């Protein structure tokens, strides 16, 4: 997370950490939407251009973490995966169109002060809130900077990072990149003449883009961190998977079996 700030304890109870069995590594963020279902980005699990192909087997899942590095004894829960469901039409070949996957845990989890699911938006809620200039929030344990080049400062946070970013007018989004954009996407962050900065980065995918309802003082997952070009660059914006456009498949996989 670029230019964010240390998250408060229990501030983002659905935050999930995708973790590699060996080598032990943080792969992505993810979120809790039930005590059995987890939502992330598909490129987190499968990205052939880079030799990426993780099976249920290769990973762990950590719910309740704050510290990135340290094992929080009676707070965190390490779960194993039963299944992985990737959108049949996720386009890894070109623009990462439909960058979504679902993970159902081996056994349910029990909610606590640090473990609590987030809502998925309804028709009403999507529409009411997915307005340009409306601010959402991002959380992660990803890169504090563009790490593939020589830089000063630490490259990764010790604790959960949080950033609050405005939604941008598609046209702005559209014109900001040579990458083919789609209805399943939305770009967010500040404009070079706003004076505020911030963005998500490498290691942030799968993390939620959440919004609070003025209507029911409830948090909803509107986006999934997806892709971007560098991090916190002027005249560029981060791209997030459009959760509302994807609910249909979402619900379909979630309710299949009883």
């Amino acid at each position: 997370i670029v230019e964010g700030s240390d998250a408060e304890i229990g501030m983002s109870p659905w935050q999930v950490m995708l973790f590699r069995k060996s080598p032990q590594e943080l792969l992505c963020g993810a979120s809790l939407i039930s005590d059995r279902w987890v939502l992330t980005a598909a490129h987190c699990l499968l990205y052939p251009p880079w030799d990426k192909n993780f099976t249920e087997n290769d990973l762990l899942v950590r719910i309740g973490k704050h510290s990135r590095t340290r094992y929080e004894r009676n707070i965190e829960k390490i779960s194993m995966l039963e299944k992985i469901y990737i959108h049949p039409r996720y386009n890894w070949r070109e623009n990462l169109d439909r960058d979504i996957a679902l993970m159902k845990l081996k056994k349910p989890v029990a909610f606590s002060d640090y473990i609590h699911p987030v809502c998925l938006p309804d028709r009403e809620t999507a529409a009411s809130l997915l307005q340009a200039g409306y601010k959402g929030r991002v959380t992660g344990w990803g890169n504090l900077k563009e790490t593939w080049t020589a830089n000063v400062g630490k490259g990764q946070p010790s604790v959960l990072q949080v950033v609050n970013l405005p939604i941008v007018e598609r046209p702005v989004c559209k014109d900001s990149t040579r990458i083919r954009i789609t209805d399943n996407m939305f770009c967010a962050g500040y404009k070079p003449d706003e004076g505020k900065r911030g963005d998500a980065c490498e290691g942030d995918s799968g993390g939620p883009f959440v919004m609070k309802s003025p209507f029911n003082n409830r948090w909803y997952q509107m986006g999934i961190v997806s892709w971007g070009e560098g991090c916190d660059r002027d005249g560029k914006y981060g791209f997030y998977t459009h959760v509302f456009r994807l609910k249909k498949w979402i619900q379909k996989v979630i309710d299949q079996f009883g």
Partner: peptide
């Protein structure tokens, strides 16, 4: 069905240090 309400915050009728910002952008 209990989703999006935080124990240490909404469960507590408490607020996070920067959620107003968000509430303030929603026209």
């Amino acid at each position: 069905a209990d989703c999006g309400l935080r124990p240490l915050f909404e469960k507590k009728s408490l607020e996070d240090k920067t959620e107003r910002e968000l509430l303030e952008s929603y026209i």
